[PDB]
Amino acid sequence: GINLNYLANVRPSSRQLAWQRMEMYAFLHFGMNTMTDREWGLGHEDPALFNPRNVDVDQWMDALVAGGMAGVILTCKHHDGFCLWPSRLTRHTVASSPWREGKGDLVREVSESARRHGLKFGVYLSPWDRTEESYGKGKAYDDFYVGQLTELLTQYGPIFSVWLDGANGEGKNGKTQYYDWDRYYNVIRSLQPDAVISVCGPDVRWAGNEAGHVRDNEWSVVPRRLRSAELTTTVSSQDDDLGSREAVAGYGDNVCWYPAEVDTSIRPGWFYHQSEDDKVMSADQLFDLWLSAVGGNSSLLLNIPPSPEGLLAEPDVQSLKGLGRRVSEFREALASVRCEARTSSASAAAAHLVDGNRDTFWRPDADDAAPAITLTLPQPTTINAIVIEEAIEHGQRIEHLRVTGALPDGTERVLGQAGTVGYRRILRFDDVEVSSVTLHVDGSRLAPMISRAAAVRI
Amino acid sequence: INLNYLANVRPSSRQLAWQRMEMYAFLHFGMNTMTDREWGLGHEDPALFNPRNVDVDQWMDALVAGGMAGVILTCKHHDGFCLWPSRLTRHTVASSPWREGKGDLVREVSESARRHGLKFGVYLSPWDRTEESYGKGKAYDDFYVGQLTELLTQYGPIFSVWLDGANGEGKNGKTQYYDWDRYYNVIRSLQPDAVISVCGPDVRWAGNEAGHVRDNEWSVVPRRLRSAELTTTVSSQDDDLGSREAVAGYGDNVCWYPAEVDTSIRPGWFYHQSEDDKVMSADQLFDLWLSAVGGNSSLLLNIPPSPEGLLAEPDVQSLKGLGRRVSEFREALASVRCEARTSSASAAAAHLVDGNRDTFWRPDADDAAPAITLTLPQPTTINAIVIEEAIEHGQRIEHLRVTGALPDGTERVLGQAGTVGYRRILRFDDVEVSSVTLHVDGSRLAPMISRAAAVRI
Ligand SMILES: C[C@@H]1NC[C@@H](O)[C@H](O)[C@@H]1O
Ligand SMILES: C[C@@H]1NC[C@@H](O)[C@H](O)[C@@H]1O
């Protein structure tokens, strides 16, 4: 009652695959709310309030390179409506502020610094707008919104992500703006075709919470309706199960590649509050989050907000530095781990599991009824995770994995189990000394294609 | 008019990769080959599909000698006979005596194209004169998506899915409103790198099937053109689709949708022995290649195999001569020595002459007369200039005048063109010159030019 030949062959586009390989990148919420100490601004704030001191975006970018970020998404306009560049379409921008004597352009500062530091740059441009007078008027706000997309996507170099937040607090009897999303997506495709359009867009799906929670099973192949879920019995982005066989079977081919992005902040708020400088996630908590998301088929978008004194604050910088060192050490441990890989079938391809090469993989024969990989360590070694990666250019297929370990006395234990793998599963467990592990890939949609398997000590 | 928008409309990665193929082949083959028809009536007996000695390697060798980059097979034409054993119908090769009923011509072509280094594409006719669900609405969308799913998952990477808008039902036949959006989700999800062509958003049917190339071909056109073959009107046939006058009213409702000129080596698309004396010559095919690949148009050239299983000798000879003339042109081109000088931004003049498609010259924004002079080492007989825009970043040139400085120090106007886009090849009579100057005197914002050359074809 399920079409595996379709589901098992749904694949990322070029832009989705390149985005997936970024793994973790940063959010920067900065703007009028940094000055008023707000999470949501009421709107119509006086631009005179936007006077941050000593802004030094290279300090921001140095910290994000120390945390191993692949890129940065700036809030160019948040829901309050204040624009961080001198848009020709509104006076509610940095050109009406005293910052840099009215001659400032923070989108220009950030995008040029990001480029010098080897970080890709993306833009957040809030659909909801509490200041713009055309908002709630229909086509007039669509024209304004498209004009501001055109400014951001033509004047600031390559854009890797356009992030379209669905949050809207108009509520009961407030303004109604039916956005022309289709029109917006033609603007973004035409002007930055390599960008991913995220959240209220077709390329990247909001994981469904903002607390850093990661699903036990995260399917990148989901009903196509989820691309509309944030745009205006219901299938919602927050649902735990979006892509099981049970959930998707009745949609047939009305399914697509729409992979999750887990967005969360290093502080309780998105914007900077000095009151929260003792509530900054530590390096160890950030690394547990990175292991959970980037080892859970979810890209990680971590926000770190600059203060009204122009900097990323010292606790945040320390946590970023710590996170980048933990991830650098883990990636070197992964790259350098040695073991002999043996397989249940197709032994000629076993070496593709342990070659370091994300474009080679092992695929069991179609009649291998118990696909498995055994990784034998050079001597008894203490491990506490396995890492497995599917060659997702060709689809996402794994549905269950059981991991067993053979201990040095030759007895065996089950170390852990997982459902989905996708871009990467990092299955963690208690520290255990083993001579070998066996990954039993005992549920899959058609034969799985695995580009890496490893046993490691985090 | 909004030049900051229009001058920045760009191809997607798949559209850029497709444009770099330049020319590739169509193979119209199937039931109509056996019935000697251009359009089949439908419900033909599969026993009539009995070609002798089908040898797809003979076809792919001939396409490699013609310099094709890939091949698009008619997997199912309007008559509805399928060249692979689909599970969705019995109107296929499985019900024919070919290959004792155990054949798959889509497999044979796709595997032989891969062995020959040719990309593979699929033509799957939306109009179907046999399939029972045609005209019922969603039941035909289910059949059609089933067949896309077979073709896009069983045969390796697919570079183009070619969705013909031709339909001969007429006023009292069957009515089928295709679910195009559903079809595009199927093709994007199974073959994301494929370009969806004709009745699709990635590649635009040029609007004739005679090999005619527009004087001005804009890849940036009103977005409504993507729906023009899907059912004052704007039509794919209009000579002017993208001038400032035609597009200004549309604002941002424009997109990148580049033209493909499709035509056949014979008067018909399928093989007719009667047309064996009507095969275009190598010289005719190479004039068509210069016109289209020098006219911001991809060229899709059909060569039809016969009921005897092969591309016929005149076709092979024409393809061979075409490939020889193209290779000689590419070598005359890579052989030219010239110094480039520019009107502004001299630091990037060398990007015009480096052979690198990813470097370009762009004049300064206040250069009022952008120009390139190409000086030859000694007087040299030429008869074309080649100029390419860096189309990854958009299409901007609107007019070009080419002058020649002769060895006596006098000068002439050699020719003029409007658009450039991927490549303009501007041809003129043989002339001996010391240098040429490409005066790019109309553009949407500052143009970005990745190649300028003067050559003798
Ligand atoms: C990333 C978060 N998305 C919801 C929005 O309401 C919050 O203010 C942050 O921008
Ligand atoms: C390529 C041509 N497109 C129109 C169709 O009616 C013809 O038979 C050919 O297939």
Ligand code: NA
């Ligand atoms: Na590998």
Ligand code: NA
């Ligand atoms: Na160049």
